[PDB]
Design an enzyme around this catalytic site. Structure first.
Site, PDB file in Angstrom:
ATOM      1  CG  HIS A  63     -20.782  25.655   7.211  1.00 15.07           C
ATOM      2  ND1 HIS A  63     -20.629  27.001   7.481  1.00 15.07           N
ATOM      3  CD2 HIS A  63     -19.735  25.310   6.421  1.00 15.07           C
ATOM      4  CE1 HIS A  63     -19.535  27.446   6.889  1.00 15.07           C
ATOM      5  NE2 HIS A  63     -18.976  26.440   6.235  1.00 15.07           N
ATOM      6  CG  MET A 270     -23.785  40.247  -1.324  1.00 16.46           C
ATOM      7  SD  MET A 270     -24.855  39.093  -0.472  1.00 16.46           S
ATOM      8  CE  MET A 270     -26.462  39.746  -0.921  1.00 16.46           C
TER       9      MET A 270
HETATM   10 CU   LIG Z   1     -22.197  28.117   6.596  1.00 18.89          CU
HETATM   11 CU   LIG Z   2     -24.214  36.654   0.205  1.00 23.86          CU
END
Ligand SMILES: [Cu+2]
Ligand SMILES: [Cu+2]
Ligand code: NI
Length: 311
Positions: A63, A270
């Site tokens: 990914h 975050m």
């Molecule tokens: Cu990723």
């Molecule tokens: Cu993070």
């Protein structure tokens, strides 16, 4: 990509230059969305300059990839689960690879300074694995990043200005929660050339600006749900003593049964904006950070685009 074996991770390119291959040590994952971390100590002790990156990723399987510089990796292990942590000290991000968004190369003359008395002593490689189907054959994976190094001092030094939140709280089901970050810039001129945004599943948009004489110059604006690569800065942007750096992440609370705060895990959030810049070697500084909101009121006059999600 294929595993290294006998030839080793280090190829000399010249007297001064050489390529270092940072690769998973033949790993086989067992679950979905797995996150593997590894480290390489820099082979030289003296100051070196990271001047280019190659992705060596099996296209079907990975990914994203991330490389850091730091002095104390979270594990002495051959590899480890990144959920355990990347570095105990500050993980300085150098490279991001994403699948549906291919990276752009460092400008020529621009290089990350590593090693020596002050620079990073270790690279840390983070490989996020997605769909684990290709491992029906239980085969070993050796994906990662080849890295071009040199002893020749670069005229321009790459660095990171990391803006991130610390005090955000996202009330459950709350339509909109804005995370503001602002700092006054105190160093020699920096030129921003790329950005990466990072939220978890709740972020909607992230925008970073340079404010000067009260006027907002866009550095970068991205959906954080898109692949979180380093994206090129459209027109390069100088930030200069006096300027104010401002970023906002837009979050939602919808979907959540409980309040959400800043944290490491997937059920936490975050709001990080990574501004990749370069400076004149003699002035240059590798890392800067803003974890405050020194000019909160200034956000009143933020552009409207920082509040509407991208087409
Ligand atoms: Cu990723
Ligand atoms: Cu993070
Ligand atoms: Ni300029």
């Amino acid at each position: 990509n294929e595993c290294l074996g006998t030839i080793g991770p280090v190829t000399p390119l010249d007297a001064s230059d050489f390529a270092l291959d940072i690769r998973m040590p033949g790993v086989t994952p067992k679950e979905s969305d797995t996150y593997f971390c590894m480290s390489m100590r820099l082979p030289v002790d003296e100051e070196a300059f990271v001047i280019d990156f190659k992705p060596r990723a099996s296209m079907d399987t990975v990914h994203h990839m991330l490389l850091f510089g730091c002095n104390m990796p979270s594990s002495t292990g051959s590899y480890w689960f990144c959920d355990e942590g990347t570095c105990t000290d500050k993980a300085n991000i150098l490279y991001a690879w994403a699948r549906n968004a291919p990276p752009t190369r460092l400008p020529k003359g621009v290089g990350f300074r590593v090693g020596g008395e002050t620079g990073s002593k270790y690279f840390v490689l983070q490989v996020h694995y997605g769909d684990i189907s290709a491992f029906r054959d239980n085969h070993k994976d050796c994906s990662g990043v080849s890295v071009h190094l040199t002893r020749v001092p670069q005229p321009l030094i790459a660095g990171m200005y990391l803006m991130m939140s610390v005090d955000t709280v996202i009330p459950p089901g709350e339509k909109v929660v804005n995370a503001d970050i602002s700092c006054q810039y105190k160093m020699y001129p920096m030129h921003v050339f790329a950005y990466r945004v990072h939220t978890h599943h709740l972020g909607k948009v992230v925008s970073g600006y340079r404010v000067r004489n009260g006027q907002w110059t866009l550095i970068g604006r991205q959906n954080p749900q898109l692949p979180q690569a380093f994206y090129p800065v459209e027109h390069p942007v100088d930030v200069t003593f006096g300027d104010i750096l401002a970023a906002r992440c837009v979050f939602t609370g919808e979907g959540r049964t409980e309040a959400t705060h800043i944290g490491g895990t997937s059920s936490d959030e975050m709001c990080n904006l990574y501004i990749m810049y370069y400076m004149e070697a003699k002035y240059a500084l590798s890392f800067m950070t803003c974890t405050k909101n020194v000019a909160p009121d200034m956000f009143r006059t933020i552009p409207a685009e920082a509040n509407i999600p991208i087409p």
